[PDB]
């Protein structure tokens, strides 16, 4: 692992957020999701299993979400 | 130029990668960019890992463009070339004899 690493906080609370996020997802995975019945399951099912809580999780491009099954394809504007 | 009109007619060059855009909609496309559709496909082409291009040039089959006899016929009796021999008749008319 690491000898050392460098880290330093983010000042005065300015933490962006993202305006659009790109998700690419399995067949089975995918046909899951959308076989929900509304708008808001499919919101509550992304959020239970990824663990990604609105406002407080920090997502990055090109983010696997689980190994060789899903990814999260890219972000924008910010990375 | 008959035979290969034809056989573009018959080749039609039509019906390529149809459909290659796959139906990815989802419900929470809203409250933001209505031009949905342009990003996706934006994002469909920014997938691919690089322009290859790397396709057979000899899928084409050109070669199978050949003429017919009926083909042959749309000359259509085209006009001549030259009027009439009334006007170069004295052109053999003065070497009936041996040339000077």
Same mark, same amino acid.
């Given at each position: $692992?690491m000898?050392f690493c #460098? =880290?330093?906080? !983010? ?5 962006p957020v993202?305006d659009?996020?790109? =998700?690419?997802?399995? @067949?089975?995975? #995918?046909? /899951?999701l959308m076989?929900?019945?509304q708008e808001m399951?499919q !919101?509550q =099912?992304l959020? #239970? /299993?990824y663990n990604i809580?609105?406002?407080? $999780? &920090?997502?990055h491009?090109?983010?696997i979400?689980t190994?060789?099954?899903?990814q999260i ?5 910010f990375? | 130029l008959k035979?290969? *009109?034809?056989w573009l007619?018959?080749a039609?060059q039509?019906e390529? &990668?149809?459909?290659?855009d796959n139906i990815?909609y =989802?419900?929470?496309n809203e *409250?933001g960019?209505?031009? @949905?559709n342009?990003?996706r ?7 691919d &890992? &690089? *322009? @290859?291009?790397?396709?057979? $040039?000899?899928?084409?089959?050109e070669? $199978?463009?050949?003429?017919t !006899?009926?083909?042959?016929?749309e000359?259509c009796? @085209?006009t /001549?070339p030259? !009027?009439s021999?009334s006007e170069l008749?004295?052109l053999?008319?003065i070497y009936?004899?041996?040339? /000077?």
């Amino acid at each position: $692992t690491m000898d050392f690493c #460098y =880290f330093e906080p !983010i000042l005065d609370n300015v933490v962006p957020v993202l305006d659009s996020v790109t =998700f690419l997802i399995n @067949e089975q995975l #995918y046909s /899951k999701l959308m076989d929900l019945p509304q708008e808001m399951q499919q !919101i509550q =099912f992304l959020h #239970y /299993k990824y663990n990604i809580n609105s406002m407080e $999780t &920090v997502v990055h491009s090109r983010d696997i979400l689980t190994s060789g099954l899903c990814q999260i394809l890219n972000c924008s504007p910010f990375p | 130029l008959k035979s290969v *009109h034809r056989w573009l007619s018959a080749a039609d060059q039509s019906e390529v &990668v149809p459909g290659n855009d796959n139906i990815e909609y =989802f419900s929470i496309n809203e *409250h933001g960019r209505r031009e @949905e559709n342009r990003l996706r496909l934006k994002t469909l082409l920014q997938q691919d &890992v &690089v *322009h @290859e291009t790397k396709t057979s $040039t000899s899928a084409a089959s050109e070669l $199978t463009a050949v003429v017919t !006899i009926n083909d042959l016929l749309e000359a259509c009796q @085209e006009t /001549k070339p030259s !009027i009439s021999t009334s006007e170069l008749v004295k052109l053999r008319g003065i070497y009936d004899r041996f040339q /000077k």
